Structure formats: C-alpha cells, structure tokens
Amino acid sequence: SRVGKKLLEIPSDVTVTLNDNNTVAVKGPKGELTRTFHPDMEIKVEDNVLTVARPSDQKEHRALHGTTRSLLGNMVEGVSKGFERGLELVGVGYRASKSGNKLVLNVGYSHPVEIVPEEGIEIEVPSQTKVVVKGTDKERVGAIAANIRAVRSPEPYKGKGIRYEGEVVRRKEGK
Amino acid sequence: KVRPSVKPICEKCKVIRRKGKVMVICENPKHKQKQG
Amino acid sequence: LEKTLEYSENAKEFQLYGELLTANLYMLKKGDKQAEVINYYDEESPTITIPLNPNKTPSENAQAYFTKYQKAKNSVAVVEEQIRLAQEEIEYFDQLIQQLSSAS
Amino acid sequence: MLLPKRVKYRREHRGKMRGRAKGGTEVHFGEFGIQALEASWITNRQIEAARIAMTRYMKRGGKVWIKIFPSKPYTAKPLEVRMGSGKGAPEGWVAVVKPGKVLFEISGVSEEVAREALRLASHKLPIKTKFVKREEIG
Amino acid sequence: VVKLQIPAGKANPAPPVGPALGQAGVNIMGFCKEFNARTADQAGLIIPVEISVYEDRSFTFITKTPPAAVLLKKAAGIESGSGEPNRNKVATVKRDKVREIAETKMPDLNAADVEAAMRMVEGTARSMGIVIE
RNA sequence: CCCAAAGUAUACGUUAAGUGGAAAAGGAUGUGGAGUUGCUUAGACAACCAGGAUGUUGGCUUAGAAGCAGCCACCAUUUA
C-alpha cells in the first residue's frame, strides 16, 4: 500500500555498499554516486534487490522511508540507464551552440548567453531547436534544466524561450 | 494574491501548507493564494 | 428604422458569404481575402466570389458574419415593434396637436 | 426594516445578557435554522441584510420566518458634548439575542440551498453561528 | 477515414461532400456521379457512406444502411421530430415495419440475433417520440 | 536549571509555534483522541499496461449541435 514495501530490482551490472553510519556508494557503468543518510534507518541489501525498512509508524519515519527508497530507486535507475531532460528553443533566432565543453545560447539578448556545466554532466546540441542534457543524477540534471530555463522564462503569448516536452503554456490574446 | 481567507476558487484548486502557510495552487495562475 | 429594415436584407447576403467562406476555409488561412469561392447552392454556378476578411482568424470572420445575422433577425423583431410604437405615438401627438390648436 | 411604531417608553436601560435563551430555542416552524452561540445586540439593519441575503439566493422557494424582533431601543447622545446633562435621544432598535436562540427559519428548499443561505445570513451577523435542523423522536 | 451522412438527392454541389473530399486531395465532381449512381434507388434519404483514404489517390466507398431515425421517418411519414419526445406523441409505428427496419440492418450491426436488433430499434423509436405500437 | 533558597523529581499524555511569553471576525489535507458508515485477501483506495464501443451525426435547435450551444423521457446490445 506504500512504496517502502515493493521490491526494487537492479540490472546488470551494479553493486551497492553498506558502510557504517549509513553512507551508500553505488558503482556502475555510467558513473558514481555517494550520499549521506540518517542514522535512524537500518538498511539491508538482498540478492540483486534493495529493501528499506521502517523503525516505527511516526510521521517523520513514514516520510523518510519513502524518500530513502525513492532516491535509492533514482540512484539505481541513473547509474545504469541515466536520465535525460530534453529542451526546445522555439523561435526564429534561437540557437544553442557548442564551443568545447562550454554551452552557448543565442537568446535574443544583447549579450551572448554562456552557462558553465559541472563535472559529470554533458550537453549535446544535435539540431536547430532540440537540445539534450546528459547525466547520472536526477537532481543535477534538474538543476541544470532550471538554470537553462532561468535565463529566459517562456512568455505566455507566443512560444518562446526554453520549453520541455509536452506541456501547455496558457495562451493569451493580444491586440 | 495575499489574503487571510485562502479558499479554493474552482474545482482544480488544491490546498497545501508550504512553510507553515496555507496556500492554494491551481492550473489557473489567477487562483494562487497565500496567507501570512 | 426603415433604414435598418433594409439593412435586414443586406445582412442576409453577408450571412450567405460567411457560409460560403466556411465551406471553403481549409486553405489560404494565413491572411485570407479575395479568395475565389465555388457556388455551394443552386444550379446557377454564379461567378466565383472573392470575399475580403480582416486579420482575426479565417473562421472567426465567417462566425462574425453569422453573429451579425443573428443580431439582424433580433432587429427584425424589435424595430418592427418600435415602428408600431412610433406610429402610435405620432397618432397620439397629432391628436394632441389638434386638441391644443382648437383649445381655449 | 423592522421597528415598533409605538412604545411605552422611548428610553430604557441596556439590560444584561446572562444565561441561555429563555425561549425560541428549538426549530419548530421551518426545517432548518441558525442557533446562536454568543450574545450581542442585533440591529434591525443586520436583520434586514441577512434577510435580503437569504431571500435573494432563495428566489424560488418558501418564505423566511424572522424569529427575532428589535423591540428594545438604544439611546445615542450627540457627539462632541460633555458627559451627563440628561440622557440622549434614541437612535435605533436592537433585539436581545441569547445563546441557543433560533434567529431565522427556512422550509421548502433543498439541504444545500438552505445551508448556503444560512451561511450567507451568518456572515452578516455579529455572533458565532451553527446549523441546526428539526429532530423527530417523535 | 472521415465518415459522414450524405443525402442522396443533394450530393452534387460543394456542400457536404465538397470540403471532406477537398482536404483528402481528390476532385469532388468526378465522384459525385459515382455517389449518385449508387444512391439512385435510395434517393430522398440521407445515407451514411464510409470514405476510405489511400496513398495512391484511389478511393473506394463502402456504403452503409440508412439510419434508424430516417427509416422511422419513412415508416411514419413526418419529416421533423417533436420538440420534446415522450411528451408530444406525434406518431405511432406498427411492429411489422419495425421488424423490417431491424432486418435491414444485418450487414453492418454486430447483433447476433434479430430479437436484439428489434429491442435496439425499440429504443431508437422511443428517442423519436414515436409510440412503439 | 543559573542569577536566587529549594526537584535538570516520578507516572500518563499533549503541543513544534518560541505557542508558553498580546486580540477578533473569518480561513485552513496541522496533530492526539472518541463514534458511525461503503469496500476489503471472493481481494480494498491509488499507480502502470488495455477496452474505452457500434442503434447513433438519439431527437428539437442554428449552416452545425456528430456525448461535450440550449430543451430533453435519458433507453437497447456485445458483454469481463
């Protein structure tokens, strides 16, 4: 009836550590993740499946069990498959550009837009409009997508600026 | 809009309690209400 | 009011033009005006028409024509009522002119 | 606008509002009503506002029974004068309402129509309100 | 595919068959004669015709049965229905032509038995305002 | 508890705001309790894979109301 009871099958080939004071390092083919946890939870790992168990029925533990199991699922999904957040630059003069590892956006400002990616996160620009960010952590690619959207928010009258996949902006009528 | 009478205007409105403050979020941005 | 009674017959032609535009509004939507229209009614096959529309929407121009037609038929009701009231008022005022003209 | 057209005395003591309602505690004319929880004077202007607020939303339905009447006058001395030198002139009329008293009575409509009409009436009143209905033991 | 109910006796001009076949990319006037050829023996009634679409601009039309509403107008005689059905009982249709109307709808309706079909067209007759008697 | 004399006393709960240590109408999926009621391992509320229909564009209605302007008895099948 809750997410802390369903099994989480991991693919081949990954492995997980069970270090003291609840520090979890996850190894895999596409990177490395390490997070610090809370000492109140006891974590146990079985054969090719991960389980998180609650200590009590309190509301803090009921939240924390679900958050821990969800972020472990995010780790095992990102270490083997990864996560992509696709963005589209809609407009007659909009362009994402590449100069080495630097990402350049030809947004209609009077100054060229440059954003510095962090380590382990890559951005590829295949075409006129569509751009793909690549990473192994959902938090980092979400922060990168938010930072890309922050330089130009989409305005409601016409489709301009940074836009995700399918999501409706509120259409307004001008004069 | 900031008012001490935060209420769901339409059926799509959802009442939430971010940061100890009663709030209403909705698909329509005109229905966004906060108190405190 | 009789001018609006002639505008009643004028509005019907506009409604017909809007219907013709609707049965043909699937192409040249962007900036649509003076587009030749093939006769949808009668065996007359009358000369292709060339409707001119403002830059709202290709459907909202025909829809605006159809709204003007609804207002026109409500006008057919109300202006005939107003003409009846106006002749009643003119008869009463001509009578009042008569009674004031011969009065002490 | 409710007021007596004749009174025995035009100036009266303000009285006290201790205890529960002496009468008019149970709903016995309409199906639903407002039961008072606190005691204060209710001005006939507030009664008129609540009555219009119920009657407008019940444009089709039964009539409203007004269980309270503003029989007690209150005097208001004119402004910017010294204290004393005689009691002032009467200004308006209020009804002494105690907790537990039924204020307005509605029958002949649906449940939610009556609840919303009583809520719109209660938002005009200066007292805490609650929704009550007839009980049939009986 | 775009399906539509085409009247038999007014299929020549630019109404209904015009803009439906225009957006498909075919000449309407070259197929109006083909429509009027197969709608000759059911003329005066509005017949739904399926309009299949192909990539090579060749079009073959699969005609359907007349609707139960139009067939009840044929069985009764009145053209336009009442303002409020089951409030102004304008007509009464006997059960034998009801059975005939139900039997006409064999090749398109997926009913296993004719009794199910006559129970369906009893329900369609109630929407007509027509007494099933 | 210390200033400041004497319990960082015992048992059972409650509050998470510095309420305690400043007021109301009104608003609110805060939380601890008490009591009904529909369902529930014949498998419950949500989530993910599929059906989401032909009589039928049900009628009146505006060109057009094709379930989704309005008024409307609001039915019948294939059936999981």
Swiss-Prot record, chain A:
Gene3D superfamilies: Ribosomal protein L6, alpha-beta domain (3.90.930.12)
PROSITE patterns: RIBOSOMAL_L6_1
GO biological process, one term: cytoplasmic translation
Keyword rRNA-binding listed: yes
One Pfam assignment: Ribosomal_L6
Main function: This protein binds to the 23S rRNA, and is important in its secondary structure. It is located near the subunit interface in the base of the L7/L12 stalk, and near the tRNA binding site of the peptidyltransferase center.
Family in the record: Belongs to the universal ribosomal protein uL6 family.
HAMAP family: Ribosomal_uL6_B
Assembly notes: Part of the 50S ribosomal subunit.
Protein name as annotated: Large ribosomal subunit protein uL6
From Swiss-Prot, chain B:
Gene Ontology process terms (BP): translation
GO cellular component terms, A-Z: cytoplasm; ribonucleoprotein complex; ribosome
Entry GO MF terms: structural constituent of ribosome
Presence of the UniProt keyword Kinase in the record: no
Keyword annotations of the record: Ribonucleoprotein, Ribosomal protein
Pfam families the UniProt entry points to: Ribosomal_L36 (PF00444)
Subunit structure: Part of the 50S ribosomal subunit.
Family: Belongs to the bacterial ribosomal protein bL36 family.
Name this polypeptide is given: Large ribosomal subunit protein bL36
Native species: Bacillus subtilis (strain 168)
Curated annotation (Swiss-Prot), chain C:
Record note on disruption phenotype: Not essential in rich media; synthetic growth defects are seen in double rqcH-ssrA mutants, further exacerbated by translational inhibitors spectinomycin and erythromycin or at elevated temperatures. Decreased accumulation of a stalled reporter protein. Double rqcH-rqcP deletion strains grow normally in rich media. Triple rqcH-clpP-ssrA mutants cannot be generated. No change in sensitivity to erythromycin; double mutSB-rqcH and triple mutSB-rqcH-ssrA deletion strains are hypersensitive to erythromycin. Loss of Ala tailing.
SS bonds (residue pairs): none
Residue numbers spanned by region Coiled-coil-M (CCM): 1-104
Coiled coil: 57-104
Record's function text: Key component of the ribosome quality control system (RQC), a ribosome-associated complex that mediates the extraction of incompletely synthesized nascent chains from stalled ribosomes and their subsequent degradation. RqcH recruits Ala-charged tRNA, and with RqcP directs the elongation of stalled nascent chains on 50S ribosomal subunits, leading to non-templated C-terminal alanine extensions (Ala tail). The Ala tail promotes nascent chain degradation. RqcH, RqcP and charged tRNA(Ala) are necessary and sufficient to add an Ala tail to a model stalled nascent peptide; does not add Val.
Family assignment from sequence similarity: Belongs to the NEMF family.
Protein name from the UniProt record: Rqc2 homolog RqcH
Source species: Bacillus subtilis (strain 168)
Shown chain mapped onto the complete sequence: 312 to 415 of 570
UniProtKB/Swiss-Prot annotation, chain E:
Miscellaneous notes: An unidentified mutation in this gene gives rise to thiostrepton resistance.
CDD domains: Ribosomal_L11
Encoding gene, per UniProt annotation: rplK
GO molecular function: large ribosomal subunit rRNA binding; structural constituent of ribosome
Family annotation (SUPFAM superfamilies): Ribosomal L11/L12e N-terminal domain, Ribosomal protein L11, C-terminal domain
Pfam families: Ribosomal_L11, Ribosomal_L11_N
Family: Belongs to the universal ribosomal protein uL11 family.
Subunit note: Part of the ribosomal stalk of the 50S ribosomal subunit. Interacts with L10 and the large rRNA to form the base of the stalk. L10 forms an elongated spine to which 2 L12 dimers bind in a sequential fashion forming a pentameric L10(L12)2(L12)2 complex. In stalled/isolated 50S subunits interacts with RqcH.
Protein name: Large ribosomal subunit protein uL11
Record has Coiled coil as a keyword: no
Keywords: Antibiotic resistance, Methylation, Ribonucleoprotein, Ribosomal protein, RNA-binding, rRNA-binding
Effect of disrupting the coding gene: Depletion gives a strong growth defect, a ssrA deletion and rplK depletion is synthetically lethal. RqcH is no longer recruited to 50S ribosomes, no change in RqcP recruitment.
Post-translational modification: One or more lysine residues are methylated.
Biological classification of the source: Bacteria, Bacillati, Bacillota, Bacilli, Bacillales
Cross-referenced InterPro entries: Ribosomal_uL11, Ribosomal_uL11_bac-typ, Ribosomal_uL11_C, Ribosomal_uL11_C_sf, Ribosomal_uL11_CS, Ribosomal_uL11_N, Ribosomal_uL11_N_sf
Domain of life assignment: Bacteria
Gene Ontology, cellular component aspect: cytosolic large ribosomal subunit
